[PDB]
Amino acid sequence: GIFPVACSDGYGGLVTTDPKTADPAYGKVFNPPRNMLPGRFTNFLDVAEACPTFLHFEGDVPYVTTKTDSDRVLAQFDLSLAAKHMSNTFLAGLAQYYTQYSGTINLHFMFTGPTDAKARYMIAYAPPGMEPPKTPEAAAHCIHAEWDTGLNSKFTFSIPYLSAADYAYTASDTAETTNVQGWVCLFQITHGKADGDALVVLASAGKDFELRLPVDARTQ
């Protein structure tokens, strides 16, 4: 006769990811040419990593002006993708679609002021367990670094991947106000006729960076 078969229940009922492919019913189509076409790419952490973006900010502007008082802290916020300044950036304008991640992200700095405007800044990075400082003095006890304007302007600091689990989420809750990943915080040493200048910070994916588990869920 013929090969028997078990019409197995539950195997084959349409899946929005189903591994197999459907049936073709036209075939024999020779398309145009796609030769060396400009600026292609095939990975979003390739352009993320490859072309940073500035950060939204208080007000909205990307830059930041030199405080001329004891209040030095030029920045400070939740070290996670929820980060408002990031929430719009290229790397953040996508981590939405991936439940978790790991890796490193970068913070590039720039000056724009006169040459008669020599200035100094700081970059502290504290973790979960305590609230961020407000005094580079107290902060100089985290994993940091100091720099001062010069000939070359830019500078990109990579911030460390630290967490119990090798991962953790991109989303957040009013349970995580203690954040599972830290409160990175940038400050301001001293300066000269360098008050009110522009120190714009951008963001790219460091090499350590990685992103996984696709999640789509209403985002505009």
């Binding site: 459907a22 073709p24 040419p33 796609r34 990975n43 490859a50 929430s87 939405q96 790991s102 996984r212």
Partner: protein, 184 residues
């Protein structure tokens, strides 16, 4: 990692710098071809529906990622929970062209329609934005019609865009946007 900045030559930085090591990331998931192959259920507006893409919700995964790379190419795998017989018709083919059973006139079963779809544009490439709400009439992957179509999904295939675009999301308010995840 200092450098010149008004030069915008890619000048990254990484762990090692001040300390620590750097790891072996497995980005398999952020693979453009991988995360665009998974159906998008757009509203099959009546019966005579054009296989466009800017019809899809510009907020869904395959939608968004779609709206982020100017150029692109790919094929199609559709779905049609519906009524009657889906009689698709190629690109350029007269609106009216879609009716004759001789054309690919699929015959209903239970319950939708899973079929493959070549990319049939006369142009060597297509786009979500033509500088030429106002985009070209050759920008359609064929066109379907049955006699009542309830589910329209487009699994894009063998994906591959070119050039980039801006990616932003859910404007928070507390520097940290809060939204219930999956808890025990």
């Amino acid at each position: 990692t200092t450098s010149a900045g008004e030069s915008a030559d890619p000048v990254t930085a990484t762990v090692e710098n001040y300390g620590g090591e750097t790891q072996v990331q497995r980005r398999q998931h952020t693979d453009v071809s991988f995360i665009l192959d998974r159906f998008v259920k757009v509203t099959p507006k009546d019966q005579i529906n054009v296989l466009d893409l800017m019809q899809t919700p510009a907020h869904t995964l395959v939608g968004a990622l779609l709206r982020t790379a100017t150029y692109y190419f790919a094929d199609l795998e559709v779905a049609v929970k519906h009524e009657g017989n889906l009689t698709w018709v190629p690109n350029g083919a007269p609106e009216a062209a879609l009716d004759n059973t001789t054309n690919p006139t699929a015959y209903h079963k239970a319950p939708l329609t899973r079929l493959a779809l070549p990319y049939t544009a006369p142009h060597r490439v297509l786009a979500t934005v033509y500088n030429g709400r106002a985009l070209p009439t050759s920008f359609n992957y064929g066109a379907i019609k049955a006699t009542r179509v309830t589910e329209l999904l487009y699994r894009m295939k063998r994906a591959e865009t070119y050039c980039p675009r801006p990616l932003l999301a859910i404007h928070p308010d507390q520097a940290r946007h809060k939204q219930k995840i999956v808890a025990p």
